[PDB]
Design a protein around this ligand. Structure first.
Ligand code: DGD
Ligand code: CLA
Ligand code: CLA
Ligand code: CLA
Ligand code: CLA
Ligand code: CLA
Ligand code: CLA
Ligand code: BCR
Ligand code: BCR
Ligand code: BCR
Ligand code: PQN
Lengths: 159, 80, 141, 34, 82, 29, 82, 62, 733
């Protein structure tokens, strides 16, 4: 459809990309007995290959003129499962990491030896902050609105 | 031939003259910091550019500054 | 103070070395250092190797000024020995350098003039873009 | 090539003689105290 | 060499069996690193020369490897103790 | 320059241009 | 310390040249597979005596030629080397 | 100048601690001192020192 | 002034060998000389400009003369597809008989070189058909170079020196440049294209002897002065026109056809004439804008001053930005270099898509050379622009005059700019490398269907909006109902849509997942290079590590080992670091272009379209595969025409490797080595009769960096020029 790519469950080049690999695996397989560890491993590999090729066609990815999936990172509603759906969860996880790290730094900074608490972590406080870091957007936006997110008296100097 | 300068922030640590391996920097009476001492570079014709002086002054930025200028035989550190 | 005068004091015992004087010493300046010792020790030469200094007076000629100052600092620190060194020209014109007024440059001394002292903080010099087509650099002012 | 005897005259006079004389002239100009 | 090696199979035909004493877990498609080395085995082909050393030492059974492994471990602890 | 005299013309013109460049360089120094 | 820093690179250079020498000379004039009647054909074909006298020979007959196994090892048991 | 133990912020344009805070230690009250205020900071500079002296007109924010 | 450098005393009194080196280095820095004033400097710039023009024209005349004397231009004119253009002849007394037999190809009687500079097609297009024309051009260029030398000497004599206040007349200079140097020159070129080029393309000879006789239009100059201008676009050449003959040629001189000539596969000459006429009129009209001395016209200072938006969003606006650009030569040099380096990449990107010369795009080994050449030139120029911006900031910027304008607020918030450039470069590099390594692992494990292939939907949509009908987007130029389509339907779209929808030329080649990744690598390269250069130019006046950098100058080695270590701190060192990234970016771009076009010319585009999405494909299908005739340029079985390249190639490597020698090892080792070498020379008999004047010393620090960078760059350029010429010309696509 879009970008001149056909869906993968109709691509006549995907069939070859499957059957050639299957036949290679079977050529490897025919060097043992059907009741030996190499044969079991190879049959498992073949079943995994079939299960993989019978999922891309059902998902809705568009293959190319060479029989290979192509990702439409465009915003297309028929393809949200390629970029934006995993991208949102990644952004969630990364904001989580950053927010809990920032909060740990903020809390440690007001102590006796803050430099000591950075080579020797204090696991109770760090764990508390990691736990509380689940609702980080509702906290980051709240700190932005309340004017608590940024400083103004930065210590940069240039003569 | 390099140009040494001593700005009026020396607290008289005397380390600049202790470190210079050419007898270039010397102490001088100058009231104003704590002990009426200051550095002075009368023999700049012998500085090679070692910058051992600047690596010793414990001032905010610095109080003794070496500016590398025209090159000669003494300043190049040659022995041949 | 009257600068000390050179003499023909003996030299430390040394079997030779390949890090001695070169042709620079006969067409240009060269240096010579003296000191006084109470016994006969073994001291490391700033040119490689060891030598046994002699009791009383000793005189040693080197090729640079930094060599003399290095050896003299080592003496004053390890052996507690005071010293001077001069610079000699091709035409035999001795010039007295290191203890210029007797007191080493660390201890303060009266009758010393300040050279290269600026009456301002280092971060106050004018930019190098106003003093263009005018050979004052930034700091000689 | 019309002449065809000039390339046998010039590259010996431009890759051998020209540097040989300009390097000598520039060495006399460099190593002089005026 | 005792547990994940085709040593006993190598001993029966040292000229057609490639040495191998390392196998890889099948997780992300890396299973293909376990190449067909011969003797009914599948693993990376080693080049340490340990099979030749064991053949020259007289070692002829995986058991005779197991024991010495344990032996080494003992010495390890011993060394640490010292 | 398929002819013969034309090469001589080019040579003498290059020589004149060389003298001009020589004078300019002398003036620049 | 800086002299040791500078000598590490020249040691690397020397040992790399030694191992290249050994590899090519062995594949060219020592190893091979003999057939009946005595005929022995080395791996590369005895091209070390004639092609190793020019840097271009070390570029194509050793690097370009012998590097043709690792580059196209994808999809095989020798993939980790590639 | 300022009081002892007072938290002041630097204004020296060529200072490592520019726009940073520090507590005064002891300001010398001699007649001819050009930089009497002594302030110690809780972060060393590129050289490793944390104490420095300024003039009273060169640093004040409270 | 009594030694080699007479413009400096510091180098004169230098007894060491360094006096020589730093005499050749600081030979063109007229600003930092002895006893320099603002009126000697400008006149020296003027005379050096005249000398440079003289050298350029002498080079062009030499090219003309050598193609006319030894080349086979006439033969190439009548068969531009089955003959090779000769550059010049070679006479090497070291050659051997097989080399003479190898290099004697073409039509020449001896050994010669083959011109990969494309001058043959250029000269043939504009209407040169005989060695006599080339010789006439050569002698005329000798004449104009002599005239430029005459003027350069003249304007240094005391009577005729211009004043410093004459140079700073920016209004009149810009007025005259814009009007004359652009519009009148384009008008003269239009006249030549109309009179000599287009008729010679139609078939009829037109030269000086019959200029005033043969008119370029059956009804010349009548319709022009009567406003009936369409008469000059009545009947153009058809698809059957043979370039050179009159077999199916029209009579129109100006038109707008678009697309390529079906035979030569290049743009229409009449189109170039029309374009030059249009831009000539545009430039002539745009000339009369600034007040010179006639009452009307603008004051280019009050224009700058008047553009401070109310609200203080960017401070005092552009107030004062006139004096800075006028008095400082480095500001003008940086602006000139940037604006020149953008268009010298524009020409590279355009000349390959729309070949402007007859029978180009069929010399598969010439277009590659042209593109690579111009892109490397553009890279060097873009680096020089930032270098001179940094020099301006160091030694020409006055923080008091530039009080709170935009130029000061750029220094006010430079930390944010550097931080965001850092973030962009890190992001791009992380993700590009991640995707490439993921595809590499996926191809390594035998499962090519698990790699992240991303279709470049934005660029494909743009191409569809230009009329391409491959992706079926049908937007704004593939749509038959869009007003943009109906507007240009009568004028040029019949040719433009025809050329762009033919998948055999370089006009908007198709793109897939393999182009996406390379474009992102190019973005990463650009971003990192600008990051280095901008960091240098901004922290060239001072940073927290060294807040007096303006007092030390542009290039200084370091500030000692103290304060943790301040090696490699100056702005010249920022430029020296950025040169590497510039070379790397240009190498990526040229690799991409060359592989794409090799695969297009061979016939299997589906090899690039499928083997570029991973990284071993680049190393095996492009570098290792296309090097089979290069290294075989000579062998124990003989040699062939590529042998020279097979030499040069290796040569490159050597030089390149030698660069490392100057970048890894530093001075303190080499000086301590020279100090004993001098001893060994002094303490030997029969060899102490000789004696050096300049004391031998090791190269300086910045000098070592410079020599290392020069070696690296020369090797990088040579080992790729050799490869791109040998792998292509050895196959010709
Ligand atoms: C087109 C080429 C045509 C053919 C050329 C072939 C000729 C062979 C080349 C000769 C090179 C000589 C050796 C290198 C130069 C010496 C290095 C050096 O001294 O280097 C240091 C120089 C001189 O330093 C100057 O040093 C000065 C020292 O002051 C001296 O000078 C002052 C007045 O000048 C005062 O007198 C002062 O007292 C006195 O000490 C100051 O420090 C100045 O600030 C400082 O600029 O530095 C500078 O700025 C560097 C100046 C050059 C900058 C150009 C760099 C461009 C590099 C681009 C990369 C090359 C890539 C090649 C690509 C090719 C692809 C095929
Ligand atoms: C950088 C440019 C850009 C940006 C920011 C977006 C942004 C967005 N696109 Mg989008 N898009 C773009 C270029 C862009 N698109 C291009 C070039 C195409 C090809 C024509 C599309 C085709 C496209 C489709 C088909 C759809 C989006 C949709 C969306 C939204 C989800 C989001 C606002 C979706 C949307 O808005 O749903 C209503 C949707 O369905 N886009
Ligand atoms: C810059 C232009 C240029 C260049 C690079 C060359 C290059 C070459 N010419 Mg040449 N030539 C030129 C212009 C040029 N020519 C012009 C304008 C003429 C007409 C007078 C000639 C006439 C000519 C003849 C008759 C012959 C050559 C030959 C050669 C080759 C051997 C070198 C030699 O003997 O030169 C000799 C050069 C001259 C006798 C005249 C020099 C021409 C101008 C004045 C030099 C340009 C100055 C230059 C721009 C400044 C360089 C600065 C630089 C050092 C930094 C070489 C490929 C020879 C050949 O074919 O060998 C195979 C040969 O026999 N040339
Ligand atoms: C009509 C009047 C006129 C004209 C024609 C010129 C022309 C020129 N002046 Mg000038 N000048 C003028 C009036 C004029 N000036 C006045 C009134 C003043 C008083 C203020 C000055 C003050 C002045 C100074 C101070 C300087 C000049 C300089 C120059 C030269 C610029 C360098 C050059 O040749 O670039 C040539 C550029 C072009 C031809 C423009 C091409 C357009 C772009 C950049 C390239 C596009 C090329 C195209 C796409 C493809 C062609 C390539 C082909 C191989 C296919 C040029 C000859 C400079 C010089 O050379 O010094 C001697 C210089 O330093 N002028
Ligand atoms: C800019 C360079 C240039 C030059 C030097 C010439 C020169 C010439 N052209 Mg010409 N021409 C040019 C550009 C140029 N053309 C362009 C761009 C076109 C395309 C429109 C033409 C189209 C053209 C035609 C169709 C004809 C000529 C003709 C001529 C010749 C006689 C002109 C004539 O009768 O005076 C014209 C009479 C005038 C009174 C003109 C003076 C006033 C003008 C408008 C001044 C221009 C503005 C000024 C600079 C300010 C003459 C050799 C004629 C001929 O017989 O040639 C063989 C002819 O028939 N030309
Ligand atoms: C129009 C082209 C052009 C012009 C006229 C200049 C002119 C100049 N450059 Mg420059 N430069 C250019 C392009 C140009 N450059 C490019 C493309 C680069 C990038 C490779 C550089 C990189 C460069 C550096 C790194 C330096 C110069 C320097 C200089 C000045 C002294 C040159 C010297 O010492 O010899 C001189 C004003 C030097 C300078 O001004 O030192 C203060 C200097 O250090 N240039
Ligand atoms: C021992 C190796 C060797 C040597 C010495 C030569 C020598 C020569 N070859 Mg050659 N060649 C060789 C191997 C060699 N070849 C091999 C193996 C091949 C491959 C089979 C070739 C292929 C070949 C071709 C295809 C050509 C040559 C040509 C030439 C001649 C160039 C002369 C010239 O233009 O001078 C001028 C020299 C230069 C311009 C280069 C110097 C530039 C310097 C390094 C940079 C600038 C210097 C700087 C400004 C400071 C110095 C200034 C100075 C004045 C003091 C010369 C006779 C050419 C020829 O015959 O034309 C006449 C030619 O076209 N050769
Ligand atoms: C939609 C879409 C799209 C687009 C996109 C875009 C265009 C974007 C933009 C964006 C932007 C333009 C951005 C902005 C920026 C930002 C800012 C300005 C801010 C910053 C941030 C912050 C501040 C953060 C914070 C944080 C957090 C939150 C967490 C932790 C960490 C931190 C702390 C960092 C596309 C086509 C792709 C696809 C489809 C969809
Ligand atoms: C002459 C004589 C004598 C002597 C004898 C002798 C001298 C003996 C010796 C003996 C000996 C000298 C012995 C020894 C032994 C040893 C052994 C028995 C060992 C073993 C070992 C092992 C078993 C090992 C193992 C291992 C390995 C291999 C590796 C891993 C680890 C381990 C360690 C485990 C006498 C007096 C009697 C008598 C008279 C005569
Ligand atoms: C540091 C410095 C400097 C330098 C700077 C630089 C070197 C820059 C560069 C820059 C650059 C080099 C930039 C560029 C830009 C570009 C642009 C901005 C473009 C735009 C474009 C456009 C606007 C387009 C549009 C369009 C389209 C897209 C389509 C259709 C057509 C049209 C046209 C509509 C200076 C000397 C100044 C000053 C001092 C400091
Ligand atoms: C080799 C080396 C030397 C010593 C190298 C020397 C003394 C250079 C001299 C080489 C010979 C004598 C000249 C070579 C001639 C060239 C082919 C061209 C000369 C320049 C043209 C203008 C003629 C250094 O001093 C050095 C300093 C800092 C970092 C790295 C190094 C470094 O690598």
């Amino acid at each position: 459809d879009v970008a001149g790519l056909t869906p993968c469950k109709e691509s006549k080049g995907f069939a070859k990309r499957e059957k050639q690999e299957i036949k290679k695996l079977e050529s490897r397989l025919k060097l043992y007995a059907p009741d030996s560890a190499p044969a079991l491993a190879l049959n498992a590999t073949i079943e995994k290959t079939k299960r993989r090729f019978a999922f891309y066609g059902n998902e809705g990815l568009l293959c190319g003129t060479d029989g290979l999936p192509h990702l439409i990172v465009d915003g297309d509603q028929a393809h949200l499962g390629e970029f934006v759906y995993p991208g949102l969860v990644f952004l969630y996880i990364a904001g989580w990491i950053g927010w809990v790290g920032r909060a740990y730094l903020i809390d440690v900074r007001t102590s006796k030896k803050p430099t000591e608490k950075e080579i020797i972590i204090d696991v109770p406080l760090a764990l508390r902050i990691m736990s509380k870091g689940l609702t980080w957007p509702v906290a980051a936006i709240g700190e932005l609105r309340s004017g608590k997110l940024v400083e103004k008296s930065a210590n940069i100097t240039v003569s | 031939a390099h140009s040494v300068k001593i700005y009026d922030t020396c607290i008289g640590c005397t380390q600049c003259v202790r470190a210079c391996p050419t007898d270039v920097l010397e102490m001088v009476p100058w009231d104003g910091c704590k002990a009426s001492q200051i550095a002075s570079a009368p023999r700049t014709e012998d500085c090679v550019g070692c910058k051992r002086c600047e690596s010793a002054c414990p001032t905010d930025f610095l109080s003794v500054r070496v500016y590398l200028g025209a090159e000669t035989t003494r300043s190049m550190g040659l022995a041949y | 103070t009257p600068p000390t005068l050179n003499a023909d004091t003996p030299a430390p015992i040394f079997g030779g070395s390949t890090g001695g004087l070169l042709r620079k010493a006969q067409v240009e300046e060269f240096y010579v250092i003296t000191w006084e010792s109470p016994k006969e020790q073994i001291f490391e030469m700033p040119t490689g190797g060891a030598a046994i200094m002699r009791s009383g007076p000793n005189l040693l000629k080197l090729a640079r000024k930094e060599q003399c100052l290095a050896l003299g600092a080592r003496l004053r620190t390890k052996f507690k020995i005071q010293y001077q060194f001069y610079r000699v020209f091709p035409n035999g014109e001795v010039q007295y350098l290191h203890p210029k007024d007797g007191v080493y440059p660390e201890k303060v001394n009266a009758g010393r003039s300040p050279v290269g002292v600026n009456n301002r903080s280092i971060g106050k010099n004018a930019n190098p873009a106003e003093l263009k087509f005018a050979h004052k650099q930034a700091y000689d002012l | 090539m019309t002449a065809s005897y000039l390339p046998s005259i010039f590259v010996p006079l431009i890759g051998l003689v020209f540097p040989a004389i300009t390097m000598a002239s520039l060495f006399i100009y460099i190593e002089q105290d005026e | 060499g005792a547990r994940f090696s085709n040593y006993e199979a190598w001993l029966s035909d040292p000229t057609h069996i490639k040495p191998s004493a390392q196998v890889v877990w099948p997780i992300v498609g890396q299973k293909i690193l376990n190449g067909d080395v011969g003797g009914g085995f599948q693993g990376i082909q080693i080049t340490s020369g340990f099979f030749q050393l064991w053949r020259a030492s007289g070692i002829t059974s995986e058991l005779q490897l197991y024991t010495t492994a344990i032996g080494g471990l003992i010495f390890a602890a011993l060394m640490l103790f010292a | 320059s398929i002819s013969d005299s034309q090469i001589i013309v080019a040579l003498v013109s290059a020589f004149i241009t060389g003298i001009l460049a020589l004078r300019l360089g002398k003036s620049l120094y | 310390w800086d002299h040791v820093f500078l000598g590490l690179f020249w040691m690397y250079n020397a040992i790399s040249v030694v191992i290249f020498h050994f590899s090519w000379k062995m594949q060219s004039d020592v190893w091979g597979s003999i057939s009946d009647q005595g005929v022995v054909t080395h791996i590369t074909g005895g091209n070390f005596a004639q092609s190793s006298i020019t840097i271009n020979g070390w570029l194509r007959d050793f690097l370009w030629a012998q590097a043709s196994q690792v580059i196209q090892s994808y999809g095989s048991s020798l993939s980790a080397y590639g | 100048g300022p009081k002892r133990g007072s938290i002041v912020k630097v204004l020296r344009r060529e200072s490592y601690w520019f726009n940073d805070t520090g507590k005064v230690v002891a300001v010398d009250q001699a007649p001819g001192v050009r930089y009497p205020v002594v302030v110690r900071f809780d972060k060393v500079n590129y050289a490793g020192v944390s104490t420095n002296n300024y003039s009273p007109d060169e640093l004040e924010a409270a | 002034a009594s030694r080699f450098p007479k413009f400096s005393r510091g180098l004169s009194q230098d007894p060491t060998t360094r006096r020589i080196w730093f005499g050749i280095a600081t030979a063109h820095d007229f600003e930092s000389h002895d006893d320099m004033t603002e009126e000697r400097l400008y006149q020296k710039i003027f005379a050096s400009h005249f000398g440079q023009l003289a050298i350029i024209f002498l080079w062009t005349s030499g090219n003309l003369f050598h193609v006319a004397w030894q080349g086979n231009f006439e033969a190439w004119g009548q068969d531009p597809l089955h003959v090779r253009p000769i550059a010049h002849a070679i006479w090497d007394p070291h050659f051997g008989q097989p080399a003479v037999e190898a290099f004697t190809r073409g039509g020449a009687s001896g050994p010669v070189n083959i011109a990969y500079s494309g001058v043959y097609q250029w000269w043939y297009t504009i209407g040169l058909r005989t060695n006599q024309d080339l010789y006439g051009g050569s002698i005329f260029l000798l004449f104009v170079s002599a005239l430029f030398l005459i003027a350069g000497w003249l304007h240094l004599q005391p009577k005729w020196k211009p004043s410093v206040s004459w140079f700073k007349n920016a209004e009149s200079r810009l007025n005259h440049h814009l009007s004359g140097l652009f519009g009148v020159s384009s008008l003269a070129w239009t006249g030549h294209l109309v009179h000599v080029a287009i008729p010679e393309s139609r078939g009829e000879h037109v030269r000086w002897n019959n200029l005033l006789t043969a008119l370029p239009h059956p009804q010349g100059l009548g319709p022009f002065f009567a406003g009936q201008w369409n008469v000059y676009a009545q009947n153009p050449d058809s698809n059957s026109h043979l370039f050179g003959t009159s077999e199916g040629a029209g009579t129109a001189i100006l038109t707008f056809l678009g697309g390529f000539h079906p035979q030569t596969q290049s743009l229409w000459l009449t189109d170039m004439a029309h374009h030059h006429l249009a831009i000539a009129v545009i430039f002539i009209i745009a000339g009369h804008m600034y007040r010179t001395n006639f009452g009307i016209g603008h004051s280019m200072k009050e224009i700058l001053e008047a553009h401070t938006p109310p609200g203080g969003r960017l401070g005092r606006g552009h107030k004062g930005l006139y004096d800075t650009i006028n008095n400082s030569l480095h500001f003008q040099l940086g602006l000139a270099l940037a604006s020149l380096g953008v268009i010298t990449s524009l020409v590279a990107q355009h000349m390959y898509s729309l070949p402007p010369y007859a029978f180009l795009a069929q010399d598969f080994t010439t277009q590659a050379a042209l593109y690579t050449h111009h892109q490397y030139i553009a890279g060097f120029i873009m680096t020089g622009a930032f270098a001179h911006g940094a020099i301006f900031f160091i030694r020409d910027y006055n923080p008091e005059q530039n009080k709170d304008n935009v130029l000061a607020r750029m220094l006010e918030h430079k930390e944010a700019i550097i931080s965001h450039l850092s973030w962009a470069s890190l992001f791009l590099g992380f993700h590009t490398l991640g995707l490439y390594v993921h595809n590499d692992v996926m191809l390594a494990f035998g499962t090519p269907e698990k790699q992240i292939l991303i279709e470049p939907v934005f660029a494909q949509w743009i191409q569809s909006a230009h009329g391409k009908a491959l992706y079926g987007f049908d937007v704004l130029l593939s749509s038959a109902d869009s007003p943009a389509f109906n507007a240009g339907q009568t004028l040029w779209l019949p040719g433009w849509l025809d050329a762009i929808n033919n998948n055999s030329n370089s006009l908007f080649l198709t793109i897939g997942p393999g182009d996406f990744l390379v474009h992102h690598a190019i973005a990463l390269g650009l971003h990192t290079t600008t990051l280095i250069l901008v960091k240098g130019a901004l922290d060239a006046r001072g940073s927290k590590l060294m807040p007096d950098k303006k007092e030390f100058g542009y290039s200084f080695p370091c500030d000692g080992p103290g304060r943790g270590g301040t090696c490699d701190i100056s702005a010249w060192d920022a430029f020296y670091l950025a040169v590497f990234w510039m070379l790397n970016t240009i190498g990526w771009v040229t690799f991409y272009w060359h592989w794409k076009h090799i695969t297009l010319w061979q016939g299997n585009v589906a090899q690039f379209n499928e083997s570029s999405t991973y990284l071993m494909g680049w190393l095996r299908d492009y570098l290792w595969l296309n090097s089979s005739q290069l290294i075989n340029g000579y062998n124990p079985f003989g040699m062939n025409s590529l042998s020279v390249w097979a030499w040069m190639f290796l040569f490159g490597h050597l030089v390149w490797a030698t660069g490392f020698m100057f970048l890894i090892s530093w001075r303190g080792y080499w000086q301590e080595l020279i100090e004993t070498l001098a001893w060994a020379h002094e303490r030997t008999p029969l060899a102490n009769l000789v004696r050096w004047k300049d004391k031998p010393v090791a190269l300086s620090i910045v000098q070592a960096r410079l020599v290392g960078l020069a070696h690296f760059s020369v090797g990088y350029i040579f080992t790729y020029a050799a490869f791109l010429i040998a792998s292509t010309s050895g196959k010709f696509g």
